[PDB]
Amino acid sequence: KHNMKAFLDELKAENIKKFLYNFTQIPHLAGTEQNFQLAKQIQSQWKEFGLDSVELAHYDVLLSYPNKTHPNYISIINEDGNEIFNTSLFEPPPPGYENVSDIVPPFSAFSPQGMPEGDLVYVNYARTEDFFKLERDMKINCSGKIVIARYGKVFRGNKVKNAQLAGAKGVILYSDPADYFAPGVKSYPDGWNLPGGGVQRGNILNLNGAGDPLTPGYPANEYAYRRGIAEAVGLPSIPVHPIGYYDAQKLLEKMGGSAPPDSSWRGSLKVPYNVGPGFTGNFSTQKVKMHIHSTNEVTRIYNVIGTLRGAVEPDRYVILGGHRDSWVFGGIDPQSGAAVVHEIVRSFGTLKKEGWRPRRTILFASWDAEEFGLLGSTEWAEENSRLLQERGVAYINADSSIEGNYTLRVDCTPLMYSLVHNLTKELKSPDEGFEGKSLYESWTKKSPSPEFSGMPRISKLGSGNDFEVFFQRLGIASGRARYTKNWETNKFSGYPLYHSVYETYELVEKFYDPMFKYHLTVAQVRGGMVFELANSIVLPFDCRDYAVVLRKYADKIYSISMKHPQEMKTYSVSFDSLFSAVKNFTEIASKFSERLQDFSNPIVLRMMNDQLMFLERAFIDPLGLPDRPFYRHVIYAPSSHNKYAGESFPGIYDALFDIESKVDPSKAWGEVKRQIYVAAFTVQAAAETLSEVA
Amino acid sequence: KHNMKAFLDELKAENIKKFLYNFTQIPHLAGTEQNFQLAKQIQSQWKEFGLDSVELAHYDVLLSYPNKTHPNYISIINEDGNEIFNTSLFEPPPPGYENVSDIVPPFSAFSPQGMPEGDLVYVNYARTEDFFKLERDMKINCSGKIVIARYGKVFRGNKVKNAQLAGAKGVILYSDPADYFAPGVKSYPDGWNLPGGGVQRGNILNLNGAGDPLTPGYPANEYAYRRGIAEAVGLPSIPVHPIGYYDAQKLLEKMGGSAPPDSSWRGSLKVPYNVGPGFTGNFSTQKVKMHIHSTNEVTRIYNVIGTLRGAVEPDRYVILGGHRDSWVFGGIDPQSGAAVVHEIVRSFGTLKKEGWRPRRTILFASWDAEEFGLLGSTEWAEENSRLLQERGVAYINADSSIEGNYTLRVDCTPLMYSLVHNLTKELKSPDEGFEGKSLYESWTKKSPSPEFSGMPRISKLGSGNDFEVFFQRLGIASGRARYTKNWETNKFSGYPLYHSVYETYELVEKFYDPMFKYHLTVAQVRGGMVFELANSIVLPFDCRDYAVVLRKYADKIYSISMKHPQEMKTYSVSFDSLFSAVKNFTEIASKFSERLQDFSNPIVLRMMNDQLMFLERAFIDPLGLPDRPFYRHVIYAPSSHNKYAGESFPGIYDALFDIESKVDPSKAWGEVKRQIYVAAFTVQAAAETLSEVA
Ligand SMILES: *[C@@H]1O[C@H](CO)[C@@H](O[C@@H]2O[C@H](CO)[C@@H](O[C@@H]3O[C@H](CO)[C@@H](O)[C@H](O[C@H]4O[C@H](CO)[C@@H](O)[C@H](O)[C@@H]4O)[C@@H]3O)[C@H](O)[C@H]2NC(C)=O)[C@H](O)[C@H]1NC(C)=O
Ligand SMILES: *[C@@H]1O[C@H](CO)[C@@H](O[C@@H]2O[C@H](CO)[C@@H](O[C@@H]3O[C@H](CO)[C@@H](O)[C@H](O[C@H]4O[C@H](CO)[C@@H](O)[C@H](O)[C@@H]4O)[C@@H]3O)[C@H](O)[C@H]2NC(C)=O)[C@H](O)[C@H]1NC(C)=O
Ligand SMILES: *[C@@H]1O[C@H](CO)[C@@H](O[C@@H]2O[C@H](CO)[C@@H](O)[C@H](O)[C@H]2NC(C)=O)[C@H](O)[C@H]1NC(C)=O
Ligand SMILES: *[C@@H]1O[C@H](CO)[C@@H](O[C@@H]2O[C@H](CO)[C@@H](O)[C@H](O)[C@H]2NC(C)=O)[C@H](O)[C@H]1NC(C)=O
Ligand SMILES: *[C@@H]1O[C@H](CO)[C@@H](O[C@@H]2O[C@H](CO)[C@@H](O)[C@H](O)[C@H]2NC(C)=O)[C@H](O)[C@H]1NC(C)=O
Ligand SMILES: *[C@@H]1O[C@H](CO)[C@@H](O[C@@H]2O[C@H](CO)[C@@H](O)[C@H](O)[C@H]2NC(C)=O)[C@H](O)[C@H]1NC(C)=O
Ligand SMILES: *[C@@H]1O[C@H](CO)[C@@H](O[C@@H]2O[C@H](CO)[C@@H](O)[C@H](O)[C@H]2NC(C)=O)[C@H](O)[C@H]1NC(C)=O
Ligand SMILES: *[C@@H]1O[C@H](CO)[C@@H](O[C@@H]2O[C@H](CO)[C@@H](O)[C@H](O)[C@H]2NC(C)=O)[C@H](O)[C@H]1NC(C)=O
Ligand SMILES: *[C@@H]1O[C@H](CO)[C@@H](O)[C@H](O)[C@H]1NC(C)=O
Ligand SMILES: *[C@@H]1O[C@H](CO)[C@@H](O)[C@H](O)[C@H]1NC(C)=O
Ligand SMILES: *[C@@H]1O[C@H](CO)[C@@H](O)[C@H](O)[C@H]1NC(C)=O
Ligand SMILES: *[C@@H]1O[C@H](CO)[C@@H](O)[C@H](O)[C@H]1NC(C)=O
Ligand SMILES: *[C@@H]1O[C@H](CO)[C@@H](O)[C@H](O)[C@H]1NC(C)=O
Ligand SMILES: *[C@@H]1O[C@H](CO)[C@@H](O)[C@H](O)[C@H]1NC(C)=O
Ligand SMILES: N[C@@H](COS(=O)(=O)O)C(=O)O
Ligand SMILES: N[C@@H](COS(=O)(=O)O)C(=O)O
Ligand SMILES: [Ca+2]
Ligand SMILES: [Ca+2]
Ligand SMILES: [Cl-]
Ligand SMILES: [Cl-]
Ligand SMILES: [Zn+2]
Ligand SMILES: [Zn+2]
Ligand SMILES: [Zn+2]
Ligand SMILES: [Zn+2]
């Protein structure tokens, strides 16, 4: 038989191991020849594996690279302008790779050039609330200062945006052992911890969904008109550079001024964590000087797009997509995901050779330039937005398969909650002490839902990965699944070796997943989701699960507003319309489910499948969110304070944010109420797409 | 049999006569009780006629009315401030109606209140080019002046916008016998000509598609948040009032300053047509004073929405829509269209009673508040935009069935060209001297295509009617058809009695269509289009007709650019990408047509029907056009100089408009090229929706 079990059994941990090894021997930096070579290899193998067609889609996008002959670094500069301390020019390469060429040294992609010098202020994680604490409570002024912030908690671009708006003239990012060194485990190469010479790369753009900075709205094709650099989307206006904790120790040890406001501001280094500004009296004339010479350049990138035509509904598209470009070797990020995708393709191609075709078309993507702002996925979706809008059933992402070995981590639309619960009950757990138990049982046990008993946690979709354009801009049902670690508050932080040269094949084979059984579990979850979305006669979405979270989000937003009862009186701020819309959505969803259960008629079915397919679509507002035209989903958006985090009713949330500080409370509360109207309307409108059609 | 002939034969000219009589006995001004009464009657009759459901959809929108106890008028004011001439407070009511109450006196809907006084400048039609001539060539300054403009050529809101941006402090609109009095025919009641006391009402908003000024983007429902009046969309900032040609004679006769630049500036009045500013020396201290006291008020309006459920594709919608509200009696505008719609409904309901159902759902609409800015249609489409987007096959408008009795007038998307040619070859001509001839033959003879031999003219869609939100904002294939007059350059002018109290049932029965045979022909064209769209197994759209006009529009835009060969060299302005996209669209369209001809498979069919249905949709850009977010169609938009006229490649057209006058030619030409990219891309993207789907 050709059913899901046949698909699933054909997947092998050994194949995923081999692919991972193969994809991680050299660096595959976006825009470089070696990543073009690997694109061509993936394209050739997906053809060999059986796909009906496999093409490269290329674009010319703004990327960013250090100057090879003019290295970036930071100095402590004495009063005569002698540079008495220099941060490192590279990370000490790992054993056996100390002769790899073309390892990009640590840098912040899209930093402007500059050599600012001044006094340090230490800003903790550089969160919105950390700047509130500094400026509001401690009355510390970041204007003309160089901020040094620790990585963790939030997306690094938000930190740089927050620093810039506090008036900083430069940002230094470092990894603190508090966030990137787990107690009792050894530094790479002898464990999975970050060495003091290890550095996290990453871009620091604030694109808000735009894709290529130069071509918002439209694919960066051969005839594209490009914005001038000065009108580019999302570029930081101050120099930024990242460092390891040996270098950071050196920069923080001398710091004076005010003490840390409390213990949540202290990392694990044997330094005071003085906020500053500047150094203690003896070194008070010493300054910090950045040297940043990176350049932004329009560079060609390549997505691999494979197509497996559907037997019955070829004009319906289930997309499995993940990136191929890496900072250096990509041993976790992304090749542990890409190797899983390669084996999924192999498996579907095995059944295809035996004469099987999925019911719907499956599209497989190897995205380029994810690391530089989701550029490959976005430009491709901009080019194909009409097809995706009218034909896109679902998008399953496939970045890093593992970031730990503790339990499953799922972020998806409520429309896939049931699909995921059901599939995980059919899969074996690979965890120790759950042999013979389902993945559902181990996941639910290790990662319990905060609201429901005997349910696992599933999180909301924000941004920080290639699903973003499909879900947030286009409104296509999206999901992702990976293995993760226990470490609670380290959620948006990363694993220790994230974006460092130390992220290697050996890292994975030795310390994460020696048997490739977590990878295999992840391939079963991703591939199984895709198989069901692509082959189930009725789309496997439960609209009633959306009704349930909509009420939870309404309760939550209402409780946030209700911290301001006097203003809700004065300005007549009612949530009645939103709760009404949610009630209607619940009732109408329930009736649709009855009909879906209660109908040999392919038109009713497809009509009903179209209703299911367009329900996620219905949450899109074509006017987008305020000042964020590419974030169009009214229920979810990437948090304005942390793009990695999903926020619910983002328009009302931001209208309420820090409202007690607004100068015109009438205008601010009027906007809260505008946003309530927009959300109530959109919920009601999405509900009506599920009513009888005529 | 239940086929199109059965539908068509069931339509009767006598029924349309009776409905017209019934709809035109009292005024039906948007927002008044009598128009709510008529909505309820239409709703009751459409139920009696057989529709599956018939509902009222109501909204609270910004409307505008004169103050009943404080009438609007204009004065010539002497130097002591004595008002020595007063324009009329009402039009002399027609025979037999001189006791009708509730006849709204002439006014410009949405004029702000004011009593400006100053000197006249006469601005011809107040077109963009007439202001160019005045200011550029004649060096006449409209700043602080009261402009008097003649109606005709362009939408009155454009005139008021043009006057406002020339710095005018008030606008006076009048009807000139040159434009509104045909040689050799008698004034109402003894002919169809405009009397000197007759006045054209109409709003003067510049909404650019927004709908209700207070709620752009969202339906003006019960919980809507409304913009403050000061942020309202499209409101004029200077007082405006319209007058008849007796009153205008009085205002123009004394005018001095500069003479008319040429004979195209002279109407038919026995006056000099001096541009001014001000009066000739003897009356040089006399001024013109406006008295405007109209108020803008949020007022409830009612659409009637009737549904005839489809037998096979109930989730596909063919819409026949036209307005019900009138300035006064609406004898032509709109009740001659609305009576045609009523009889179409009756006929489809006749077949429905005999057990027939169309293949697709047909929706029938009686829109409210069209006269005040397409408010009813727009708010309904804003409310239902997700259903319309994913399910809307086509929209057929149904305003005035006749504006003359010479020949057929069709404006539609290229996607309906073939449908229209074929249907008209099957219909009898009602024209004198074409008895036994097809409507196609008489129409083609009287209204030849400028490019093709033995083809009729079909025009492009702009705005100025209820199809606007469906086509320009949403991208649903749209069409309209009516009988019209010969009078060439009187195209966007109107017939003489347009928007005057004199537009009565008797006007029609006596001077336009005594046998109701033009009405009947129009009902056959509108109803027949709807019947085919709703019942043909393959949607009756020919994508190849779009390929043909796209090349014509590209040639045209390119020729406009080529008036500036030096700048096209200097700035490297190439149209290659646009011609390339058009070539691809042509080739891909041709192949799609072959497949459409060449496939018992309902999935391939519907897949193919979805491709046809989404092709118009593909021309929408979700970023909209520059500063006009509700005009989203890239191929067509209402002309920025005349909203009644469709423009092709409007983004490039406006980027090129008056470009030789721009201060930064590099920036202006850079924008031309941006717009070329946007159009080439969108054409290519629409072509790819017609490629094999996988
Ligand atoms: C959830 O679904 C329900 C449908 O079951 C829907 O209920 C609708 O609510 C609206 C808003 O309350 C109702 O609107 C009323 O409509 C009647 C005519 O049907 C009008 O006369 C009412 O206006 C008068 O009263 C108002 C309120 O006191 C005054 O402000 C106003 O000036 C008038 O005097 C009013 O417009 C509508 O009838 C129901 N429809 C039903 C029950 O079928 C509800 O709105 C949905 N929720 C959301 C958020 O969409
Ligand atoms: C109409 O349809 C045709 C498809 O038949 C489509 O043709 C495509 O045109 C693009 C743009 O010319 C071609 O792009 C080239 O692609 C190759 C790889 O396939 C690249 O190597 C090329 O880049 C080099 O050359 C450029 C031009 O001299 C340089 O600027 C560049 O730096 C590189 O050196 C180039 O990107 C594409 O291959 C074809 N596709 C085909 C024939 O299948 C055409 O674009 C469509 N028209 C529109 C408006 O979409
Ligand atoms: C990764 O695996 C690929 C595919 O097997 C290897 O590429 C092949 O290598 C052989 C030997 O050079 C050639 O004959 C083929 O042309 C390659 N096939 C392709 C590109 O499809 C590749 O060498 C492996 N890379 C590493 C680092 O082991
Ligand atoms: C940090 O790096 C700088 C730059 O390479 C070093 O300063 C340079 O030293 C050379 C040789 O002595 C001089 O000729 C240059 O003028 C210096 N460049 C400067 C000041 O920009 C500096 O020695 C390094 N600091 C440490 C502690 O190694
Ligand atoms: C997950 O599985 C549950 C249990 O099988 C599915 O719910 C059943 O679906 C069948 C088929 O329609 C119904 O007859 C049962 O009544 C359902 N049982 C319930 C609701 O407890 C559910 O549909 C699955 N979810 C998917 C496929 O998304
Ligand atoms: C227009 O025609 C309608 C429908 O026949 C007439 O309305 C009906 O009038 C009779 C007599 O008053 C009533 O019994 C019905 O209640 C009405 N039916 C409806 C509203 O469906 C209406 O009187 C006619 N109007 C004019 C001006 O002739
Ligand atoms: C035009 O209308 C105005 C306003 O009705 C007339 O002037 C008014 O005349 C009355 C009675 O004589 C005065 O008490 C008011 O003070 C006047 N109103 C003004 C000047 O605003 C005027 O007579 C009319 N002009 C003509 C020629 O009929
Ligand atoms: C208008 O009528 C023409 C002539 O009948 C239709 O074109 C024919 O369509 C049939 C059925 O597919 C083909 O077999 C013929 O080859 C076509 N003849 C041509 C192109 O000359 C055309 O499809 C009609 N247009 C519609 C229905 O939109
Ligand atoms: C790298 O360093 C210097 C800076 O002037 C110079 O040799 C070269 O232009 C730089 N490369 C760039 C800016 O791409
Ligand atoms: C912060 O300090 C700088 C010093 O010049 C100043 O420009 C800025 O206004 C200060 N901000 C405030 C208001 O504390
Ligand atoms: C894998 O699991 C074991 C058991 O808890 C743990 O000691 C080890 O640290 C895990 N690997 C990683 C990278 O977390
Ligand atoms: C009509 O005229 C006067 C103007 O002050 C007054 O009686 C009344 O308020 C007006 N009505 C309005 C402004 O609606
Ligand atoms: C037109 O005349 C007015 C008179 O005050 C003036 O304000 C305006 O600048 C003039 N426009 C020009 C530049 O001719
Ligand atoms: C109707 O047609 C006749 C014949 O040409 C013409 O004289 C008459 O003016 C027409 N009616 C109108 C309103 O044009
Ligand atoms: N995955 C990336 C790039 O994502 S984003 O910056 O483009 O959101 C990272 O977190 O660095
Ligand atoms: N049909 C109308 C209202 O149209 S528009 O002003 O809203 O475009 C008229 O021309 O007056
Ligand atoms: Ca782009
Ligand atoms: Ca609105
Ligand atoms: Cl992922
Ligand atoms: Cl019309
Ligand atoms: Zn990644
Ligand atoms: Zn990454
Ligand atoms: Zn009308
Ligand atoms: Zn009208």
Nearest to A384 by CA among A304, A451, A474, A311: A474
Of all ligands present, the nearest one to the C-alpha of A220 is 17
Contact A404, A498 (CB under 8 A): no
CA distance linking residue A473 with residue B631, whole number of Å: 20
- Residue B454, classed as helix, strand or coil, is coil
**Considering just the CA atoms, what is the radius of gyration of chain A in Å?**
25
Query: d(Cα B638, Cα B464) in Å, to the nearest integer?
Result: 9
What is the Cα–Cα distance from A469 to A341, expressed in whole angstroms?
A: 20
Fold for domain A67-292? Glucose Oxidase; domain 1 (3.50.30)
Does A230 reach chain B within 8 Å, measured CB to CB?
A: no
Minimum distance, in Å, between the CA of residue A411 and any CA atom of chain B: 26
Question: Which residue carries 């979270």 as its tokens?
Answer: A549
Three-state secondary structure string covering A153-210: CECHHHHHHHHHHCCCCEEEEECCHHHHCCCCCCECCCCCECCCCCCCCCCCCCCCCC
Q: What are phi and psi of B362, to 5 degrees?
A: -115, 130
> Which H helix or E strand runs over B304?
strand B295-308
- Asked if residues B589 and B687 have their Cβ atoms less than 8 Å apart, the reply is yes
Find the largest Cα–Cα distance for chain B.
86
What is residue A41's three-state secondary structure? helix
B603 CB within 8 Å of a chain A CB: yes
> Which residues of A are less than 8 Å from B224 in CB distance?
677
Strand B392-397: give its sheet, edge to edge: B53-65, B295-308, B360-367, B313-323, B392-397, B477-484, B407-412
B215 is in an annotated binding site: yes
CA–CA separation, B559 and B565 (whole Å): 10
The full 3-state SS of A363-401, as one line of letters, equals: EEEEECCHHHCCHHHHHHHHHCHHHHHHHEEEEEECCCC
A580 Cβ contact list (under 8 Å, min separation 6): A680, A684
| B237: nearest Cα among B191, B296, B301, B306 | B296
Backbone angles phi, psi at B242, to 5 degrees: -105, 150
Shortest-distance ligand to the CA of residue B143: 13
H helices of B88-234, in order, are: 128-132, 156-165, 177-180
Residues of B with Cβ-Cβ distance to A610 under 8 angstroms: 315, 390
Contact B498, B244 (CB under 8 A): no
Residue A370 bears catalytic tag: yes
By the 8 A CB rule, do B674 and B577 touch?
no
Decide: helix, strand or coil at residue A282.
helix
Determine if ligand 15 sits within 6 Å of the CB of residue A411. no
Nearest ligand 4 atom to the CA of A75 is 1
Residue of A nearest to B228 (CA): A670
Q: How far apart are CA A88 and CA A76, in angstroms?
A: 13
Lookup: tokens for B5: 């002939």
Q: For chain B, positions 321-360, list CB contacts with chain A under 8 A.
A: none
Facing B387 at nearest CB: one of A310, A386, A688: A688
Place of tokens 């159902």: B357
Q: In angstroms, rounded to a whole number, what is the distance separating the alpha carbons of residues A487 and A412?
A: 21
In DSSP terms, which residues pair with B479 in a beta bridge? B396, B412
Q: Which two tokens stand for residue A118?
A: 């001044």
Dist. CA B112–CA A157, nearest whole Å? 48
Topology, domain A541-694: Transcription Elongation Factor S-II; Chain A (1.20.930)
CATH number for region A1-66+293-540: 3.40.630.10
| Partner residue opposite B689 with nearest CB, options A361, A386, A576 | A386
Pair of tokens at residue A513: 């997943």
Spatial contact of A482 and A400, defined as CB atoms under 8 Å apart = yes
| Residue closest to A592 by CA, chosen among A577, A610, A579 | A610
How far is B215 from B219, CA to CA, in rounded Å? 7
Task: Identify the CA nearest to A147 among candidates A39, A238, A257, A18.
Answer: A238
Measuring from atom 13 of ligand 11, which residue has the nearest CA? A512
B361 touching A (Cβ < 8 Å) = yes
Exposed, middle or buried, B391 (CB in 10 Å: 0-12/13-18/19+)? buried
Contact A108, A172 (CB under 8 A): no
Site of tokens 């004898």 = B331
> Can you give the length of chain B in residues?
694
- How many CB atoms neighbour CB B542 within 10 A? 21
Residues in chain A: 694
Beta bridge partners of B318: B362, B394
Beta bridge partners of B229: none
Task: Enter the tokens of residue A331.
Answer: 């041993």
CA distance B124 to B265: 6
Distance (Å, rounded) from C-alpha A648 to C-alpha A222? 38
Instruction: Give the C-alpha separation, A234 to A256, whole Å.
Output: 33
In angstroms, what CA-CA distances link B355 with B311, B343, B350, B351, B352? 11, 19, 9, 7, 5
Q: Which residue of A has its CA nearest to B381?
A: A685
- Does ligand 1 have an atom closer than 6 angstroms to the CB of A682? no
Q: Which of B225, B384, B622 sits opposite A673 (nearest CB)?
A: B225
Q: Which residue in B561, B579, B555, B559 sits closest to B671, CA to CA? A: B561
Distance, in Å, from the CA atom of A645 to the CA atom of A308, rounded to the nearest integer, reads 33
Best of B218, B599, B615, B672 to disrupt the A interface by mutation (most A CBs within 10 Å)?
B218
Structure solved using which method?
A: X-ray
Rounded to 5 degrees, what are φ and ψ at B236? -70, 150
Residues of chain A with CATH 3.50.30.30: 67-292
Q: Which atom of ligand 2 is nearest to the CA of A56?
A: 19
Taking a C-beta distance cutoff of 8 angstroms, is the pair B343, B523 a contact? Answer: yes
Pairing of β A477-484 and β A392-397: parallel
Local structure of A211: helix, strand or coil: coil
Query: Cβ-count burial of A12 within 10 angstroms (0-12 exposed, 13-18 middle, 19+ buried)?
Result: middle
Is B622 in contact with A617 (Cβ distance < 8 A)?
A: no
Q: Where do the CATH 3.40.630.10 domains begin and end in chain A? A: 1-66+293-540
Please list the active-site residues of B: 370, 574, 610, 633
Contact B306, B345 (CB under 8 A): yes
In sequence order, the β-bridge partners of residue A65 are A295
Q: Are A177 and A194 in contact, with CB atoms under 8 Å apart? A: yes
Q: CB of A147 within 8 A of CB of A171? A: yes
Residue of A nearest to B361 (CA): A694
Residues around ion ligand 23, judged by CB within 5 A, are B 333-334, 399
Q: Which amino acid is at A687?
A: A
Write the DSSP assignment of B22-87 as a string of letters.
HHSSS---TTSHHHHHHHHHHHHHHHHTT-SEEEEEEEEEEEEE--TTS--EEEEE-TTS-EEEE-
Radius of gyration of chain B (CA): 25
Structural contact between residues B149 and B636, judged by C-beta atoms closer than 8 angstroms: no
The amino acid present at A579, given as its one-letter code, is F
Is A423:A532 a contact under the CB 8 Å cutoff? Answer: yes
User: Which ligand 5 atom is the nearest neighbour of the CA of A532?
Assistant: 27
Q: Which residues contact B92 (CB under 8 A, 6 or more apart)?
A: B195, B197
Which of chain B's residues have a Cβ under 8 Å away from the Cβ of A219? Answer: 681
Which residues neighbour ligand 19 (ion) by CB within 5 Å?
A 397, 399, 480
Measured by CA distance, the residue closest to atom 11 of ligand 8 is B597
For residue A9, the one-letter residue type is D
Give bridge partners of residue B362 from the DSSP assignment. B308, B318
How big, in percent rounded to 5, are the helix, strand and coil portions of chain A? Answer: 40, 20, 45
Spatial contact of A582 and A547, defined as CB atoms under 8 Å apart: yes
Test A694 with B386 for CB contact under 8 angstroms. Answer: no
Residue A146 pairs with which residues in a beta bridge?
Answer: A120, A170
A396 close to A466: Cβ distance less than 8 angstroms: no
Pair A23, A334: CB distance under 8 Å = no
Q: What is the DSSP string of B595-610?
A: HHHT---HHHHHHHHH
Beta bridge partners of A407: A484
Copy the structure tokens of residue A24. 């991680």
Within chain B, which residue ranges are assigned CATH 1.20.930.40? Answer: 541-694
Residue A103: phi and psi, rounded to 5, are -75, 110
Q: Hey, are the CB atoms on B680 and A223 less than 8 Å from each other?
A: yes
Q: Which of A312, A384, A391 has the CB atom closest to B603's CB atom?
A: A312
Chain B positions touching A390 (Cβ under 8 A) are 390, 610, 614, 617, 689
Strand positions, DSSP E, B570-678: 636-639, 642-648
Strands (E), B431-487: 477-484
- Are A606 and B606 in contact (CB < 8 Å)? yes
Q: What is the dihedral of CA A448, A451, A452, A456, to 10 degrees?
A: -30
Contact B603 A313 (CB under 8 A): yes
Q: Say if CB B386 and CB A617 are below 8 A apart.
A: yes
How many Å lie between the centroid of ligand 20 and the Cα of residue A318? 42
- In B81-129, the DSSP E strands lie at 83-86, 117-118, 120-122
Using CA atoms, how far apart are residues B577 and A251, in angstroms rounded to an integer?
54
In B427-467, which residue ranges form alpha helices assigned H by DSSP? 439-446
Q: Cβ A385–B685 below 8 Å, yes or no?
A: yes
In 3D space, the residue among A73, A63, A31 whose CA is nearest the CA of residue A293 turns out to be A73
